[PDB]
Design an enzyme around this catalytic site. Sequence first.
Site, PDB file in Angstrom:
ATOM      1  N   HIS A  40       0.853  -1.222   0.000  1.00 31.30           N
ATOM      2  CA  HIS A  40       0.000   0.000   0.000  1.00 31.30           C
ATOM      3  C   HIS A  40       0.886   1.270   0.000  1.00 31.30           C
ATOM      4  O   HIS A  40       0.356   2.357  -0.109  1.00 31.30           O
ATOM      5  CB  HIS A  40      -1.001  -0.019   1.242  1.00 31.30           C
ATOM      6  CG  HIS A  40      -0.472   0.379   2.640  1.00 31.30           C
ATOM      7  ND1 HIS A  40      -0.121  -0.442   3.606  1.00 31.30           N
ATOM      8  CD2 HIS A  40      -0.280   1.674   3.169  1.00 31.30           C
ATOM      9  CE1 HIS A  40       0.259   0.232   4.645  1.00 31.30           C
ATOM     10  NE2 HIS A  40       0.167   1.509   4.395  1.00 31.30           N
ATOM     11  N   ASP A  84      -0.046  -7.618   1.800  1.00 34.89           N
ATOM     12  CA  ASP A  84       0.479  -6.217   1.745  1.00 34.89           C
ATOM     13  C   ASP A  84       1.991  -6.189   1.915  1.00 34.89           C
ATOM     14  O   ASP A  84       2.524  -5.892   2.974  1.00 34.89           O
ATOM     15  CB  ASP A  84      -0.227  -5.404   2.852  1.00 34.89           C
ATOM     16  CG  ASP A  84       0.081  -3.883   2.751  1.00 34.89           C
ATOM     17  OD1 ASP A  84       0.540  -3.444   1.705  1.00 34.89           O
ATOM     18  OD2 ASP A  84      -0.177  -3.249   3.771  1.00 34.89           O
ATOM     19  N   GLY A 175       2.319   6.700   8.875  1.00 33.82           N
ATOM     20  CA  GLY A 175       3.692   7.246   8.677  1.00 33.82           C
ATOM     21  C   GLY A 175       4.692   6.136   9.006  1.00 33.82           C
ATOM     22  O   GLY A 175       5.845   6.210   8.625  1.00 33.82           O
ATOM     23  N   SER A 177       3.833   2.954   8.294  1.00 33.06           N
ATOM     24  CA  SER A 177       3.536   1.935   7.248  1.00 33.06           C
ATOM     25  C   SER A 177       4.763   1.461   6.474  1.00 33.06           C
ATOM     26  O   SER A 177       5.578   2.286   6.119  1.00 33.06           O
ATOM     27  CB  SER A 177       2.589   2.489   6.190  1.00 33.06           C
ATOM     28  OG  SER A 177       1.279   2.694   6.709  1.00 33.06           O
ATOM     29  N   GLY A 178       4.813   0.170   6.250  1.00 33.24           N
ATOM     30  CA  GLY A 178       5.924  -0.472   5.491  1.00 33.24           C
ATOM     31  C   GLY A 178       7.143  -0.788   6.325  1.00 33.24           C
ATOM     32  O   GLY A 178       8.001  -1.518   5.886  1.00 33.24           O
TER      33      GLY A 178
HETATM   34  N1  LIG Z   1      -1.022   0.190  14.097  1.00 32.16           N
HETATM   35  C1  LIG Z   1      -1.965   1.019  13.766  1.00 32.16           C
HETATM   36  N2  LIG Z   1      -2.913   1.425  14.542  1.00 32.16           N
HETATM   37  C2  LIG Z   1      -1.964   1.542  12.501  1.00 32.16           C
HETATM   38  C3  LIG Z   1      -2.914   2.254  11.809  1.00 32.16           C
HETATM   39  C4  LIG Z   1      -2.537   2.603  10.544  1.00 32.16           C
HETATM   40  C5  LIG Z   1      -3.297   3.303   9.657  1.00 32.16           C
HETATM   41  C6  LIG Z   1      -2.760   3.549   8.427  1.00 32.16           C
HETATM   42  C7  LIG Z   1      -1.478   3.108   8.086  1.00 32.16           C
HETATM   43  N3  LIG Z   1      -0.782   2.427   8.994  1.00 32.16           N
HETATM   44  C8  LIG Z   1      -1.258   2.160  10.206  1.00 32.16           C
HETATM   45  S1  LIG Z   1      -0.668   1.403  11.392  1.00 32.16           S
HETATM   46 MG   LIG Z   2       8.541   2.538   9.765  1.00 38.82          MG
END
Ligand SMILES: NC(=[NH2+])c1cc2cccnc2s1
Ligand SMILES: [Mg+2]
Length: 223
Positions: A40, A84, A175, A177-178
């Site tokens: 994503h 993902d 932020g 993510s990944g």
């Molecule tokens: N660990 C979580 N609560 C996350 C929520 C999001 C929402 C969007 C992208 N990444 C994540 S991680």
């Molecule tokens: Mg990171």
Amino acid sequence: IVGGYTCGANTVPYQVSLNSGYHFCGGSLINSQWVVSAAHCYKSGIQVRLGEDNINVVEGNEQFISASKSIVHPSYNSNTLNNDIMLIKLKSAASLNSRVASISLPTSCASAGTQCLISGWGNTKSSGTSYPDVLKCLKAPILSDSSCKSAYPGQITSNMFCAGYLEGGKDSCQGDSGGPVVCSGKLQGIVSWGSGCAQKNKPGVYTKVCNYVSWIKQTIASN
Ligand SMILES: NC(=[NH2+])c1cc2cccnc2s1
Ligand SMILES: [Mg+2]
Ligand SMILES: [Ca+2]
């Protein structure tokens, strides 16, 4: 990362920041020419930044390399976020040193209860927004699949696992993510999704890397 701490400069040497004019996702260095991140986080025009601590200050240990190719998993579903994961090949090989190192892929999957290290430059507030400039870390355990599935009914597949605290307070967030989830020296997860951040009974959901080792090894050897 919400409820975490400042890692310390280059204490997570395999952590990468994906930049397209600004930081938008994290990733992990698996060898000198390849990075694994979340599907994503796919964008055209990615520059991978290695050896970073403060992403807004050139401190001397960074390597900025453009990506030559990106490969999103053949079965990635953006609606459910199943599978993902994506691979990014660097234009030039990075130079490994103390501050830039790769992380190992798992030989087997980790068990519920195993403590992991999650890191990133994502939001640090549950109800609010504050993006940090230095890398934040969070130690969190892998949760049982039943607590994961009861929190998200009909949404967890066998390629996902939950890690965190059901009481809330500590979690990865937007932020992040990944980025990596490392347990016992192996990359076991990728920050994928969740419901809000650090909310009670809504732990973070991670891509289960141990299910993709064959695909990763095969794909990097043929590209
Ligand atoms: N660990 C979580 N609560 C996350 C929520 C999001 C929402 C969007 C992208 N990444 C994540 S991680
Ligand atoms: Mg990171
Ligand atoms: Ca920097």
